[PDB]
Amino acid sequence: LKIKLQKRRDEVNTCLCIGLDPDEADIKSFMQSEKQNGYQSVKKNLSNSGELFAPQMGGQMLLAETPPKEAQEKDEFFYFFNHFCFYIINETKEYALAYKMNFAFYLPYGSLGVDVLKNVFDYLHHLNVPTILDIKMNDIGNTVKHYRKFIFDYLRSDSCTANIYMGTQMLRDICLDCKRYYSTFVLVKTTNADSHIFQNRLSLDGKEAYVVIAEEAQKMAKQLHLEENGEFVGFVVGANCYDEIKKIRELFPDCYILAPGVGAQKGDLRKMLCNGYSKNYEKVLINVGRAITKSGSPQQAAREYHQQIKEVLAELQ
Amino acid sequence: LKIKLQKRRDEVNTCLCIGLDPDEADIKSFMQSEKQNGYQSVKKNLSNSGELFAPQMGGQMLLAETPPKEAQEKDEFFYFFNHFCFYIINETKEYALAYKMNFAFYLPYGSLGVDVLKNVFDYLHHLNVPTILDIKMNDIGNTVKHYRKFIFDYLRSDSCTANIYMGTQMLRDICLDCKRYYSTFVLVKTTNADSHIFQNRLSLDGKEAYVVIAEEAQKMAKQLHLEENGEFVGFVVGANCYDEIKKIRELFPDCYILAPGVGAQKGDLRKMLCNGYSKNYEKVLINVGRAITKSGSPQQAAREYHQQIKEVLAELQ
Numbered sequence: 001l002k003i004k005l006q007k008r009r010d011e012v013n014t015c016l017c018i019g020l021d022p023d024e025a026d027i028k029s030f031m032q033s034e035k036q037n038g039y040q041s042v043k044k045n046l047s048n049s050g051e052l053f054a055p056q057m058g059g060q061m062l063l064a065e066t067p068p069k070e071a072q073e074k075d076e077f078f079y080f081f082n083h084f085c086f087y088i089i090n091e092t093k094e095y096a097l098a099y100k101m102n103f104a105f106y107l108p109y110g111s112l113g114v115d116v117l118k119n120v121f122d123y124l125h126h127l128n129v130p131t132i133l134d135i136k137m138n139d140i141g142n143t144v145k146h147y148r149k150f151i152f153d154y155l156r157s158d159s160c161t162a163n164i165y166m167g168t169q170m171l172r173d174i175c176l177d178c179k180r181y182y183s184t185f186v187l188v189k190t191t192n193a194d195s196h197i198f199q200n201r202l203s204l205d206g207k208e209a210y211v212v213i214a215e216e217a218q219k220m221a222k223q224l225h226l227e228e229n230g231e232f233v234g235f236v237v238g239a240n241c242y243d244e245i246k247k248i249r250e251l252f253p254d255c256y257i258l259a260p261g262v263g264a265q266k267g268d269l270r271k272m273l274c275n276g277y278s279k280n281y282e283k284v285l286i287n288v289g290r291a292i293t294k295s296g297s298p299q300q301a302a303r304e305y306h307q308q309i310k311e312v313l314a315e316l317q
Numbered sequence: 318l319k320i321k322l323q324k325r326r327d328e329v330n331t332c333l334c335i336g337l338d339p340d341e342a343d344i345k346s347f348m349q350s351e352k353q354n355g356y357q358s359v360k361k362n363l364s365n366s367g368e369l370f371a372p373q374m375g376g377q378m379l380l381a382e383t384p385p386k387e388a389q390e391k392d393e394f395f396y397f398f399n400h401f402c403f404y405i406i407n408e409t410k411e412y413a414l415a416y417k418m419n420f421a422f423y424l425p426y427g428s429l430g431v432d433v434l435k436n437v438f439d440y441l442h443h444l445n446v447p448t449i450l451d452i453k454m455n456d457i458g459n460t461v462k463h464y465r466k467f468i469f470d471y472l473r474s475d476s477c478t479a480n481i482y483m484g485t486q487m488l489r490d491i492c493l494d495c496k497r498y499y500s501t502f503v504l505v506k507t508t509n510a511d512s513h514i515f516q517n518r519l520s521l522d523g524k525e526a527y528v529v530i531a532e533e534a535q536k537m538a539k540q541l542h543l544e545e546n547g548e549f550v551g552f553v554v555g556a557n558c559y560d561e562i563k564k565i566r567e568l569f570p571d572c573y574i575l576a577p578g579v580g581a582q583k584g585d586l587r588k589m590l591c592n593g594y595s596k597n598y599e600k601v602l603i604n605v606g607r608a609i610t611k612s613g614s615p616q617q618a619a620r621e622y623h624q625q626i627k628e629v630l631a632e633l634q
């Protein structure tokens with residue numbers, strides 16, 4: 001993955017991570033405008049998926065000459081969920097270092113949305129774009145092995161997010177199969193208003209909780225020999241957490257940071273990118289979800305963020 | 318749920334929570350012995366599900382006169398996964414205050430296992446036995462709303478587990494829809510060997526992290542008015558965490574504790590139940606998974622735990 005991200009970086013010249021978190025309004029509204037416009041976006045998905053992608057879950061109906069009928073409410077919902085996702089990808093992939101799919105959004109409909117999630121990850125695997133499953137997964141080792149099978153065997157994700165409140169020994173079961181190695185990003189500092197209550201107010205020997213968490217995480221990453229095997233344990237540090245992103249880059253010059261919170265949550269892209277800067281700029285993934293997926297034009301949204309990042313990285317070079 | 322658990326308690330006279338975490342060996346081995354024995358357990362599932370349960374996901378094939386053929390590898394796997402789960406339930410439900418299903422185990426096979434999970438929760442809803450989804454879910458409010466829809470709308474779970482490293486404001490989006498209220502158990506102290514590294518070594522003003530987490534959690538539970546609305550925020554406290562379970566019961570006399578770690582993980586049932594005792598004994602859910610699901614006789618395993626708990630509660634009365 002370290003090589004995969006470096007190669008991708010040099011190809012798209014950005015650290016923009018597109019967040020794909022489709023909610024019911026997004027899907028319903030996309031269906032609505034596709035019905036009205038004669039399925040323009042669907043037709044683009046069918047031609048522009050190059051060699052062309054064949055969805056494994058309901059591939060025939062998704063690739064069909066005519067969409068499902070409205071009487072088939074479930075099928076219709078599945079059809080437009082998949083094509084909404086495919087559309088966001090095709091519109092934005094030229095500007096994307098990675099995509100991060102938040103698991104929560106693919107669950108409210110039962111198995112239906114997991115088949116969609118499978119199709120999304122498979123398509124991105126087909127395109128070879130770096131992938132993140134945002135799951136903030138955590139449990140005891142034996143249970144975590146089963147999360148690993150879902151994330152890394154079934155979805156074939158490049159990485160996921162993980163919550164290490166339980167301890168770092170958990171990393172041994174998510175990041176290794178002895179022979180296969182996988183990357184994860186651990187929650188360090190989060191974007192929500194009250195994140196300071198445990199992440200900053202708790203401490204050990206003068207060091208804030210988030211620092212203790214980062215330090216113990218890298219101690220374990222080294223014990224696991226991930227980096228010798230092309231993989232890493234990175235850090236989720238909120239785009240509005242300017243002090244913490246600075247601190248984390250200071251203490252761990254070569255770490256990989258995943259930074260959500262720009263756009264919908266009003267994080268200061270320039271302030272955060274300056275604070276968390278690495279010349280190896282795939283080491284700050286700036287995640288933007290709703291500011292792209294809910295915009296009038298996701299392509300232009302993506303392009304705008306691509307340009308702003310380009311401009312800030314020029315300032316910093 | 319407080320009333321539901323009290324009523325269930327008086328009916329089964331225990332605080333035993335059965336863990337249903339089926340791994341691939343469990344399913345394969347159950348299929349194997351059902352093929353050999355002429356599908357005895359399946360036949361019991363079909364007669365003893367009372368009025369009889371009709372699975373919503375693949376109900377016809379599950380209720381069928383003859384199982385799927387071996388050529389249909391996926392269908393066959395789904396069939397024996399569901400019937401393994403149904404079998405553990407029918408064998409143990411007389412001894413169970415609740416069942417806790419760990420989400421991880423229903424994921425490695427994609428949508429297939431989520432349909433199974435749906436069938437399990439629906440059957441338990443049909444039987445009206447209290448349910449817990451063990452997911453240790455955590456994210457920002459907007460994302461958490463979608464986890465709530467899965468857990469509480471789709472699965473119709475009575476409760477779930479939650480990880481509040483991010484903060485307690487998250488509880489507002491998992492425990493409330495303003496008008497509907499739901500129960501959750503937050504991770505306080507976990508069973509893994511290295512759980513002390515953050516849960517005990519981090520502190521604020523003399524108080525260990527796990528205590529700060531419990532205190533802030535109940536502050537929020539009160540702000541949310543859950544208990545006036547029949548619901549609660551409980552605590553996950555490991556069965557091997559004797560000191561912490563004592564401390565938590567001391568500080569919060571009326572809290573609900575979910576205590577895994579007895580059986581496979583060798584937690585001291587008597588030591589933990591004594592330390593965490595409430596006369597309202599649904600307030601210590603003693604979870605036992607593998608010690609029941611991997612035993613030669615889950616019915617007898619369950620019965621043994623039921624008796625030990627009965628005996629310890631007599632000591633304590």
Ligand SMILES: O=c1cnn([C@@H]2O[C@H](COP(=O)(O)O)[C@@H](O)[C@H]2O)c(=O)[nH]1
Nearest residue numbers: 102190191238260264288289290456460
């Ligand atoms: O501290 C964090 C950690 N994770 N996320 C996740 O990153 C995404 C942000 O999306 P947005 O750009 O639509 O706000 C969502 O998937 C959210 O769950 C955050 O927003 N903040």
Ligand SMILES: O=c1cnn([C@@H]2O[C@H](COP(=O)(O)O)[C@@H](O)[C@H]2O)c(=O)[nH]1
Nearest residue numbers: 139143419507508555577581605606607
């Ligand atoms: O501190 C914790 C928290 N959760 N669990 C969960 O409780 C169950 C224990 O199952 P067992 O009885 O098979 O060990 C599993 O679902 C596991 O993920 C623990 O074991 N320990």
